[PDB]
Design a protein around this ligand. Structure first.
Ligand SMILES: CC(C)=CCC/C(C)=C/COP(=O)(O)OP(=O)(O)O
Ligand SMILES: CC(C)=CCC/C(C)=C/COP(=O)(O)OP(=O)(O)O
Ligand SMILES: CC(C)=CCC/C(C)=C/COP(=O)(O)OP(=O)(O)O
Ligand SMILES: CC(C)=CCC/C(C)=C/COP(=O)(O)OP(=O)(O)O
Lengths: 137, 138, 139, 138
């Protein structure tokens, strides 16, 4: 077991971000970001665009590195350790709506207002927000 | 082959940072930061202090996250991909001097002024500095 | 697989361009330009006029190079990578209407006004326009 | 045979571009740009950076698409057809010296002033300049 690299994407649309409830043995039914695992030779931005396309069908642009978090899941059915790179992006077409391309992993994607976020948030995301992190600013 | 996580440490001492020439198959003879590979369950700060201890003997404190870089070495003898978390830290004892504690991996560690950095810098470090990154004020 | 060269044609007619919905494993039912694959020894302009003739029956002239785009489809049924040369052209006979000469690749061709383009556009086209590219005024 | 994509790079340094005489069955001994063949999945910029590193060791940045040319070599020993994407770039470190990293394919790289270009230029490059193309102002 070694740390693995993930990229998660804050897709900003107006005052909203895209979230969807996980179907997973880690954080089941909590609201999480679209994201994926970084592949050998891939840039953060190439991974962000690929994962978002794979999971939601959405086309994004104007990507920007935000931060990196250390996310250890000790009590998981298989304990895992992710180092997660956060990327901000916006839609190429602001009217494009997400599709649930991987329903085995997610209940569906929807837009949530920064001032009315749902609960429960996936703990890595809740923890990051609790630190004062704001993807818009 | 998959991306692996490293932590690299800017040890800030006055106006200087610690650098040492690599003895390595990647970036041989270039000036680089002390650093290490993140272990399972380890925090960024724990890895930074441990790697600096292992390589230099220096005791550091007040670790703070600076940024993250993507460093691919496809044409290396062994293709490697590192995601590198940069950490800022200071000496617990500002009079402590570095030792070359892993002398097979580094020619020796010394302090370099921010305004008189040595050449050649390890390419990931040169690339990061070329973006305007400054570890003292970031 | 290796990158392959395509030529795509912006046929400018008044304020309109020619588009048609693809019948394809890639970008199915999205609006795209007439175009074709560059043949060995062929010029961009020859490719543009030939592909437009083959797909639409239209006769074009005054071909001019616009730009080049890199379009990778790693997740297609068959992963593909195209390098697409954009060409501007006009009708030799402005009254000539397109025909759906290759109905296996396209639902049909129509003229669409630059300020009222249809949706959904084929993703390479949407991406190019998103950059501010305008075939009428480019260059 | 099928058209194949190349990328060629105008590395701008002051008023100069990098050129080197080809050792090749096509355009032998003529002055040409660093470049390479586009790989499946690669962006134009990734190819430009990779090819320049492979051939010269130089690190480049600020890459921009310039134009595209159609370069048919019917008279070649193996007739070839290249579609060549021109990319503008600059050095990360303007003091970095080129190396002749593939000395079987190039006699050596040097910087040439825009107002004193060498002869004979590789015909695809000569022909492009003959149209009035200028990589500094495009
Ligand atoms: C700050 C944030 C939001 C960090 C995200 C943490 C993360 C990548 C968890 C693993 O998710 P996963 O679904 O990729 O792992 P698995 O498929 O193994 O459950
Ligand atoms: C200044 C920056 C961004 C450095 C990050 C790049 C990096 C971790 C290279 C590998 O070093 P390594 O010595 O830990 O790996 P290896 O011994 O396998 O070559
Ligand atoms: C028509 C337009 C706007 C094209 C832009 C870019 C592009 C990838 C063309 C290739 O499509 P193709 O149909 O020629 O290739 P394939 O048949 O393999 O899908
Ligand atoms: C200045 C311009 C427009 C150059 C483009 C022309 C070109 C790609 C020639 C082939 O180079 P190559 O060295 O890759 O050919 P080969 O390897 O087949 O000998």
């Amino acid at each position: 077991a070694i740390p693995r690299v993930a990229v998660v994407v804050f897709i900003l649309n107006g005052n909203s971000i895209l979230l969807g409830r996980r179907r997973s043995s880690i954080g089941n039914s909590t609201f999480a970001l679209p994201g994926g695992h970084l592949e050998f030779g891939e840039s953060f931005e190439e991974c962000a665009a690929r994962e978002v396309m794979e999971e939601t069908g959405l086309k994004i642009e104007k990507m920007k590195l935000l931060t990196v978090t250390n996310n250890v899941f000790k009590e998981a059915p298989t304990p895992s350790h992710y180092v997660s790179v956060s990327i901000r992006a916006v839609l190429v077409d602001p009217s494009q709506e997400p599709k649930n391309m991987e329903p085995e992993k997610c209940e569906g994607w929807d837009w949530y207002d920064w001032e009315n976020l749902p609960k429960p948030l996936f703990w890595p995301l809740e923890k990051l927000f609790g630190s004062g992190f704001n993807p818009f600013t």
